[PDB]
Design a protein around this ligand. Structure first.
Ligand SMILES: *[C@]1(O)CN(S(=O)(=O)c2ccccn2)[C@H](C)C=C[C@@H]1NC(=O)[C@H](CC(C)C)NC(=O)c1cc2ccccc2o1
Length: 215
């Protein structure tokens, strides 16, 4: 029972996705956390509609960008989110076409991780499931990452611009990390993932804006 978890081994995370040229990273982040909780409560893992969120989460700005809390608040108020199959991903903002028949999950709200508290994120990841997190992915070093535990002191924890997913945490070569699922396709990083330095002064501010849905 080493202090480490990986929800990919448990069957809680869907295949890596590609948001393409659309500021919908927040949507894929949101869908991931929801997929994790959907499996945990029903034993069924499946793809949810990040498109459903872009077209319908009016608090957000479609491909212009958005926040994960607003998407969770939307699933709650809407009383459901469609599955991918029932609401395919196009990559551009379009009118909301939410369909009750395509309902695959809902949520009773969300819970935010206190700002900068990696220990709280660690505990949320360990006992709840995959967690939505915001980081600073502007650095070129992040874009060309390919292996190991990522960490670059230039990462501005006050400059959050990308929304990804925390699928687990552990240690590689004496270096703690966060198993992060990205939405730039499986050709990026390590088959769609990247191990990010954990407990190193909240690098890239991985714990400054994290949250998860409640089902
Ligand atoms: C998100 O898509 C991340 N990227 S990106 O994946 O590198 C990329 C590259 C090229 C084309 C598209 N996407 C960029 C930084 C672009 C923006 C996306 N970022 C967000 O959506 C961000 C996520 C937060 C920091 C967790 N949210 C916003 O920028 C945001 C929040 C809003 C609320 C209301 C109106 C508009 C908002 O934008």
């Amino acid at each position: 029972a080493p202090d480490s978890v990986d929800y990919r081994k448990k069957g809680y995370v869907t295949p890596v996705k590609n948001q393409g040229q659309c500021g919908s990273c927040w949507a894929f982040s949101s869908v991931g956390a929801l997929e994790g909780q959907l499996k945990k409560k029903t034993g069924k893992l499946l793809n949810l509609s990040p498109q459903n969120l872009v077209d319908c989460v009016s608090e957000n700005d479609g491909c212009g960008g958005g926040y994960m809390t607003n998407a969770f608040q939307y699933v709650q108020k809407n009383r459901g989110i469609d599955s991918e199959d029932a609401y395919p991903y196009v990559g551009q903002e379009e009118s909301c076409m939410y369909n009750p028949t395509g309902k695959a999950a809902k949520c009773r709200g969300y819970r935010e991780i206190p700002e900068g508290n990696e220990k709280a994120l660690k505990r949320a990841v360990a006992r709840v499931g995959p967690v939505s997190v915001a980081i600073d992915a502007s650095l070129t070093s992040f874009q060309f990452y390919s292996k190991g535990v990522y960490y670059d002191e230039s990462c501005n924890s006050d400059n959050l611009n990308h929304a990804v997913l925390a699928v687990g945490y552990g240690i590689q070569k004496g270096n703690k990390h966060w198993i992060i699922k990205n939405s730039w396709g499986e050709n990026w990083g390590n088959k769609g993932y990247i191990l990010m330095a954990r407990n190193k002064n909240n690098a890239c501010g991985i714990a400054n804006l994290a949250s998860f849905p409640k089902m």
